[PDB]
Q: What sequence folds into this?
RNA sequence: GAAACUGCGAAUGGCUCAUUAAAUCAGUUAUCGUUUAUUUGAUAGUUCCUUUACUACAUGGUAUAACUGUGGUAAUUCUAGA
RNA sequence: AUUCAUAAUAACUUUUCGAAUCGCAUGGCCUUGUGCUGGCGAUGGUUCAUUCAAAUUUCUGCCCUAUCAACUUUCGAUGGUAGGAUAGUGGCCUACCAUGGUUUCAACGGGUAACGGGGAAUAAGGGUUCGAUUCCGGAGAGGGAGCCUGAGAAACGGCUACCA
RNA sequence: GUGAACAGCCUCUAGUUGAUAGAAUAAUGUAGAUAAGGGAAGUCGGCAAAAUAGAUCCGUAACUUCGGGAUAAGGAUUGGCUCUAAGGGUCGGACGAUCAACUU
RNA sequence: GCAGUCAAGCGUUCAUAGCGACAUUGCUUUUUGAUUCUUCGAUGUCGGCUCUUCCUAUCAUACCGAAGCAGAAUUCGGUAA
RNA sequence: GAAUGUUACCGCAAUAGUAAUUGAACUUAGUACGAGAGGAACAGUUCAUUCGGAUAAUUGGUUUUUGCGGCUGUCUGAUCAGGCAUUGCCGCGAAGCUACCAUCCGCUGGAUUAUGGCUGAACGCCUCUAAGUCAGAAUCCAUGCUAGAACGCGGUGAUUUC
RNA sequence: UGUACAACGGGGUAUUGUAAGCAGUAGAGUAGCCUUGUUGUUACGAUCUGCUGAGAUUAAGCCUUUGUUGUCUGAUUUGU
């Protein structure tokens, strides 16, 4: 069972209470009693009628509890595999400290330094062929 | 309704089915992003915390963060937004969309786990799922490994093995910047 | 090389003759009264700062599609949460 | 023909532009750092010109009609000043002020089974009748209005509302 | 005083406060009001009631004895406050001094 | 005004399902006449409105019997106000 | 409301009154019947019509709550706050009253009529009828409901010192 | 003489819609006077904002009540 709210006064409407208007467009309006109903019919503006939720909001009457309510939290956790990387490859990789990196590194870094100058002499090779390669 | 639960630490996900108005009802008037303590919804999820993220009503309309409302409304939508992918430059469409406030009119709630509960959920905590693609731009490789503008990438790029049958190969990105 | 991002195009073409009588339209003028993607030709040594203990330039930032996975609706080039 | 082009002074600016982009080649030059240099061309970029446009705009020219004689200022009608708005001139709009503007040389109103032109048909000449329709211009996308995108649309094989 | 006013409403001067009284507040009355939705279906018949109404500005048909019809009809406006402008008199030679109203 | 008896006829055939001529017996007193008993030192006209009650020759509704009642619809009839 | 000793409380029930009404939809069923066209009902379900008896949570009407506020004109020197204007006017307005304008409630047994039958003579057959008898209606009689005979009645309490 | 009753007061419930008073570099403005304005002041000014969902009313046929105050043997009849 639902408590509707008065669409002029913001008042709680319990089952059976008040009335429900259905306008031409089809905007539904609900009033809690015949006072809000009437003020609505007179084309009053809730924002200028002081007892309403709407006026009270537009005039910062009340609040105070909301300017007090601040903070609260809680968060987080850990790690999942990646397919082609079990948590173990991930432990193994992550763990190993710089001196093995530099090691690994400067090895390969020397290892293909060889490949480079090797392919280079390979160029001059198919070229002292191609500045020869006769009849 | 059906719950769509994601464990975004592992990259896992599974669905769950709740019948029982009282077990559900914990989610009512809760909005997108609100947290929900687990035990209320079940004994399995005891302790578990859920941050609500969206989901669909019957008739399938997606929720849209920020509307408020526990109903459906039709909005003009634009480039760069939820529940709309524009067909043409500067096209906008007026489309039905569901409010961001949970009601029993939903076929599916979409939750993301924020804190793990006291017990394991099988397809979610037990299983763990590899991040499809690795860093491609230079300095993102530098960051995903912590490196210094000294270390040289090339041998830090990822290397994905895939087989021709009796010829197993090795493909890496193509570093940029 | 699919998908998708990005860019460009969809303001051309084609069709019809309902309006329209100093309107349109024609010939003739005006911009010393303006906008102009593009094409073509040119056109940029100056950007930082109380100004010696410097400022990534050997190059700075994240957020997203496609995708993966979990979903909703009788139903559309509907789309949500992760 | 200019308060033109261009330039100088003082400042102004939620500061526009001044390349964090891509492809091919790999070469010179030493104090040997992978140093410092360096070929061809792509896409960009500000301002000016050019080209493709556009928008307004001068002069003259339209069918029948008086059983249409006065018309124009509700709620701009005609002009002045200032502003706002526009890409920009302009009652385009707004304020203030004035009392103007058109008309028997036919205004204004009505009709049109009216889109305009290039043209067509009929051959002594003068004419008469026609032109929805292969090219040019204009307008529209069932009817109205509104607008997003964009260099350009008040677009409809775009959206938005209302009406049918 | 309000206002067009010798209207209505309230007041001053003057004059009254005299027309049996007490307690209740049934029906039915007499006189005064109001009613959701419908709107003359009531009734011989809209009888009775209701609705309109002052002023300013706009606008206003047939017909006509050309005088009318006409407040035709149909519309907008109207408080309070604070300002602006315009509208006279008298006396000294295009001004100058002085006095005094309210109205638009 | 209302109801009977006879049954020639109607009703494809068949008097009487439903009807019914020529005749004939009645009933009623919301028709209209006929009368002139009461009232002309008074009994206040027509219609409507309002409201109660009564009659039954029953229109509807309850249960039945008939049919030219297949069904549906009707029609005749009973107990019924 | 006098009089039956006084006064009080609880009751009986003679007599009189009496009340409910009608429709539809779903289902039965596109069925029974029918060549087709068409086309029911009983049981069960949900509603409605006309009537009646109450009731006022709610909604609505009423407003001298002259309850709060607003407004015109005048009067109290001004202010505050008030008077008068046959209840001055306007908006809201509690309570009370009240509306098919609101909501709730409106009982179930018997005995019969018509009629259809059982057994059965009269009349050795036949026959619902003569004796006897079954079923049977918005009827009637009760149940129920309203008064309670002021000359109908029962059970019970207390019955005077100044 | 009470778990009394009443008049007040208090609390609740209602109705209306923000009292009076004070304050305000709130207010279209106009007009005075000065030291002539890094806020000049004085007069007047509908209205606006705050204190203020305030104030007023609330049984007369609303509910309640640890308070205050008061009341508590007048008249007439009746017997088997
Ligand atoms: Mg790149
Ligand atoms: Mg790059
Ligand atoms: Mg694209
Ligand atoms: Mg971001
Ligand atoms: Mg080199
Ligand atoms: Mg370019
Ligand atoms: Mg001008
Ligand atoms: Mg201009
Ligand atoms: Mg003029
Ligand atoms: Mg003139
Ligand atoms: Mg002429
Ligand atoms: Mg035409
Ligand atoms: Mg043509
Ligand atoms: Mg033509
Ligand atoms: Mg045509
Ligand atoms: Mg042109
Ligand atoms: Mg068409
Ligand atoms: Mg369009
Ligand atoms: Mg089309
Ligand atoms: Mg098109
Ligand atoms: Mg139309």
A:
């Amino acid at each position: 069972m639902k408590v509707e709210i008065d669409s002029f006064s913001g008042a709680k409407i319990y089952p059976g209470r008040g009335t429900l208007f259905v306008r031409g467009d089809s905007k539904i309006f609900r009033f809690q009693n015949s006072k809000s109903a009437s003020l609505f019919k007179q084309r009053k503006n809730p924002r200028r009628i002081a007892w309403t939720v709407l006026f009270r909001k537009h005039h910062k009457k009340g609040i105070t509890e909301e300017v007090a309510k601040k903070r609260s939290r809680k968060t987080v956790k850990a790690q999942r595999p990646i397919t082609g990387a079990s948590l173990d490859l991930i432990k193994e990789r992550r763990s190993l400290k710089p001196e093995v990196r530099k090691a690994n590194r400067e090895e390969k870094l020397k290892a293909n330094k060889e490949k480079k100058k090797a392919e280079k002499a390979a160029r001059k090779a198919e070229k002292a062929k191609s500045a020869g390669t006769q009849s | 309704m059906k719950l769509n639960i994601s464990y975004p630490v592992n990259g896992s996900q599974k669905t769950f089915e709740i019948d029982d108005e009282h077990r559900i009802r914990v989610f009512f008037d809760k909005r997108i992003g609100q947290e929900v303590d687990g035990e209320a919804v079940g004994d399995e999820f005891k302790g578990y915390v859920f941050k609500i993220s969206g989901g669909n009503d019957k008739q399938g309309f997606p929720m849209k963060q920020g509307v408020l409302l526990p109903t459906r409304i039709k909005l003009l939508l634009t480039k760069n937004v939820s529940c709309y992918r524009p067909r043409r430059d500067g096209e906008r469409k007026r489309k039905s969309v569901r409010g961001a406030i949970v009601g029993p009119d939903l076929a599916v709630l979409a939750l993301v786990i924020v804190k793990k509960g006291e017990q394991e959920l099988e397809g979610l905590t037990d299983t763990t799922v590899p991040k499809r693609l690795g860093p491609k731009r230079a300095n993102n490789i530098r960051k995903f490994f912590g490196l210094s503008k000294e270390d040289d990438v090339r041998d830090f790029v990822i290397r994905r093995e895939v087989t021709k049958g009796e010829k197993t190969y090795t493909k890496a990105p193509k570093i940029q910047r």
Notes: Residues 82 and 131 of chain A are 53 Å apart (CA to CA). Helices of chain A lie at 34-41, 53-58, 87-95, 98-111, 113-128.
